[PDB]
Amino acid sequence: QAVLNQPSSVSGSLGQRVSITCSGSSSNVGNGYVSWYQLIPGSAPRTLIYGDTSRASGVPDRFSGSRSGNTATLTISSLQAEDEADYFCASAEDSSSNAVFGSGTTLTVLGQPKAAPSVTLFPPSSEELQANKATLVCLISDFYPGAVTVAWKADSSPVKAGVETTTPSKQSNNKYAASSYLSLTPEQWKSHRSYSCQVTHEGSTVEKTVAPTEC
Amino acid sequence: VQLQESGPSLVKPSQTLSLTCTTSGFSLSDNTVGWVRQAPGKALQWLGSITPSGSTNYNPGLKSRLGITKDNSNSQVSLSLTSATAADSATYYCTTVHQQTRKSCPDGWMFGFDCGSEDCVDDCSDILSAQTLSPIYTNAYHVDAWGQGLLVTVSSASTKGPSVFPLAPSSKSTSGGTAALGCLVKDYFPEPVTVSWNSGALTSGVHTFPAVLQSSGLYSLSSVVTVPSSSLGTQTYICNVNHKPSNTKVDKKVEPK
């Protein structure tokens, strides 16, 4: 179960060129026949390169593979936003039918237009309230870069318990989205006059508020 | 071509995980099929394959626990792993492997064609009194087609179907001509759940967030869609939740306030 070595992450700007290295010994990469695969979240893995330099079907020309002894390199030229993914090299150790995969490389495509987030705060639904539960759902979408901080308030006093927040992730339009939850009891919900979701993004803070005495 | 994995999404510890891959479009007797997995946030791991002749290859560090079977008539490959631990929770992919045999001569030796042809010789100027050997065939492999994968969770906790609550748009959730609405998928185990809208007829402007593990030990997530605000009285919006670990599908109508 030897692990071929790749950099944990590389970077590159739109339209520029990026290279990803794959290190091995003389018995798995030195023999050659290295393949590369692309893994985009929500999709099945996609075979890019095989036999060191050959492209698979439907692979654009900007993807190219090469080898130089014990280190094979995958180069992606004119970088696009959809190229943000995980890339894995592979090779069979001494041609024993068993193959070893690389440690993996995460590609980041910089230079994308910055975008401020939109925030929506949903109070607990009537259905959830009828089930003796109360969850406030704060949805954040269409922002770049994918770095935000989320704070919860009750009557402007901070709240740190019962909060769950997802790490920002890519949307279909290459922008980022995140979600945050505040799980309360119906008694806690009816207690305070308002609850707030504060979203900080690049020197800006958007605050959305819900009140139990509303819709 | 098509490769579809199937099996239980939840396997209790120390039990035997078993998955089956149903194939179509290449005949299970011509091409070879392999199994690859990947733990969340880790690298791909080769588990093994089965050759068209029925021969099986396994990862050296897991051969004592693995097992692959074939059925050409039903076109189904089977994978088994005993003594399932929490480290075996991963996504398991069904793949088709393609080989490529390259012939070559030993180091220093040369072919008879490059100077009786197939044999490797020790001296080409003599090609008679020189030592003679057979060529060495070595094959390399690359994965051609990947299945969508099946998320398998190894846990002692029990399956639980999801509760679906609507995230309704109101006079404060709008953004001018567009309104955001969704549904909250609460308290399910194990992962994953799949959400769509109007039976896949509403794909523009949809996003489903990653799930979160709560303190109670259950998963929850949300799915949101942005629609024109003028349609909130004409168009009905239904979110279609799918939880294969419990064979549950939920259709929830999202009503505007």
Residue numbers in the entry:
A (entry chain L): 1 to 9, 11 to 27, 27A, 27B, 28 to 95, 95A, 95B, 96 to 106, ...
B (entry chain H): 2 to 82, 82A, 82B, 82C, 83 to 113, 119 to 259, 262
Quote the paper.
The cow antibody repertoire contains a unique subset (~10%) of antibodies possessing ultralong CDRH3s, which can reach lengths between 50 to 70 amino acids. The unique CDRH3 structure can be separated into two microdomains where the antigen-binding disulfide-bound “knob” sits on top of a long b-ribbon “stalk” and can bind to both surface and receded epitopes. Ultimately, we isolated a total of 8 and 11 cross-clade nAbs from cow-485 and cow-488, respectively, all of which had ultralong CDRH3s, suggesting only ultralong antibodies were responsible for cross-clade neutralization detected in sera. BnAbs from cow-485 were named Bess, while bnAbs from cow-488 were named ElsE and assigned numbers based on their order of discovery.
The ElsE Fabs all have CDRH3s with 54 amino acids and 4 cysteines, with a 1–3, 2–4 connectivity, Bess7 has a 61-amino acid CDRH3 with 8 cysteines (1–6, 2–5, 3–7, 4–8 connectivity), while the 55-amino acid CDRH3 knob region for Bess 4 (6 Cys, 1–3, 2–5, 4–6 connectivity) has no ordered electron density in the crystal structure. Ultralong bovine CDRH3 knob regions fold with 3 short β-strands connected by 2 loops (Loop1, Loop2) of varying lengths that can adopt a multitude of different secondary structures, including loops, helices and β-turns. The ElsE series of Fabs all have highly similar knob structures as expected from their high sequence similarity. Flexibility in the stalk is evident in a comparison of the ElsE family of structures that have similar CDRH3 knob sequences and structures, but very different orientations of knob domains with respect to the body of the Fab. The ability of the knobs to twist and rotate with respect to the body of the Fab likely enhances the ability of bovine Fabs to access recessed epitopes. There is no convincing electron density to indicate tyrosine sulfation modifications in any of the antibody CDRH3 regions; however, BLI experiments indicate that Bess7, with 3 tyrosines in CDRH3, contains one or more sulfated tyrosines. Low sulfate occupancy or flexibility in the CDRH3 knob region may explain the lack of electron density for these groups. The ElsE lineage was the most potent and broad overall.
